[PDB]
Amino acid sequence: DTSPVAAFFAACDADDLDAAADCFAPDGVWIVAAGPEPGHTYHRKEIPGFLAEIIGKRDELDAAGARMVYGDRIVVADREFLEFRCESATGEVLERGVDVFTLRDGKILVKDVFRKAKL
Amino acid sequence: TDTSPVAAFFAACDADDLDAAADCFAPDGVWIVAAGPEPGHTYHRKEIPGFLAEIIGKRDELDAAGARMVYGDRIVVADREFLEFRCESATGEVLERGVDVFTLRDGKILVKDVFRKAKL
Numbered sequence: 234d235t236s237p238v239a240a241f242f243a244a245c246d247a248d249d250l251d252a253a254a255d256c257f258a259p260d261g262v263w264i265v266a267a268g269p270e271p272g273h274t275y276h277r278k279e280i281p282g283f284l285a286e287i288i289g290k291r292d293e294l295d296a297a298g299a300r301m302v303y304g305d306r307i308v309v310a311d312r313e314f315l316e317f318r319c320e321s322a323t324g325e326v327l328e329r330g331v332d333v334f335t336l337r338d339g340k341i342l343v344k345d346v347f348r349k350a351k352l
Numbered sequence: 353t354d355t356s357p358v359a360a361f362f363a364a365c366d367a368d369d370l371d372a373a374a375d376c377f378a379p380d381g382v383w384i385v386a387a388g389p390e391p392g393h394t395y396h397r398k399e400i401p402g403f404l405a406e407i408i409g410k411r412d413e414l415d416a417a418g419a420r421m422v423y424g425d426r427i428v429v430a431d432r433e434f435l436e437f438r439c440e441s442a443t444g445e446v447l448e449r450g451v452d453v454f455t456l457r458d459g460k461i462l463v464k465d466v467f468r469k470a471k472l
């Protein structure tokens with residue numbers, strides 16, 4: 234499996250944040266679900282700092298008893314699709330969404346995050 | 353015209369045949385909108401006709417305001433289709449953006465699961 238998406242998640246589980254950032258193309262972006270665009274585009278120079286923050290949040294939520302549950306990673310041509318949800322210790326869903334990846338030359342060109350929301 | 357119930361659903365909407373649109377859903381099919389307490393809100397089959405009527409009225413006013421829906425290509429795999437969408441103003445400002453995840457069963461839509469970008 235040569236997917237940079239698989240490589241990205243393996244890097245994050247190993248806490249190898251430099252290897253995780255290197256799964257993105259030189260012009261790659263990470264577009265989070267919330268922000269003015271709507272959404273917010275993190276450019277490549279911003280991904281290391283963002284990764285550090287989200288890995289910290291992952292560890293805190295894990296310590297608080299929550300867990301991330303991923304669906305099947307689905308690949309079609311140059312796109313990968315991945316559903317996810319974070320559940321608390323009670324099963325309450327804390328976040329649910331889907332990642333849409335666009336790949337180019339074996340690197341992540343776009344990680345585009347979409348979410349469910351409360352009112 | 354593709355026989356996929358996703359293609360059929362959008363064809364019926366464009367044709368303003370809202371009964372035909374709803375019948376693209378399985379008898380136990382659901383439409384999970386992006387926002388609600390779940391998070392999201394699950395509309396069951398019997399509630400889909402009333403919800404469809406609302407969004408079509410919203411579509412018609414946005415269309416009259418010069419906005420347009422721009423759909424990606426339907427990406428088909430396993431028992432599922434993925435469809436990105438965005439609503440743009442007459443000048444290209446993005447008003448809405450998201451992706452539909454369709455779970456299919458026996459030629460009907462079992463789940464339409466809507467995910468979105470959001471402003472703060």
Ligand code: NA
Nearest residue numbers: 354355356359
């Ligand atoms: Na078809």
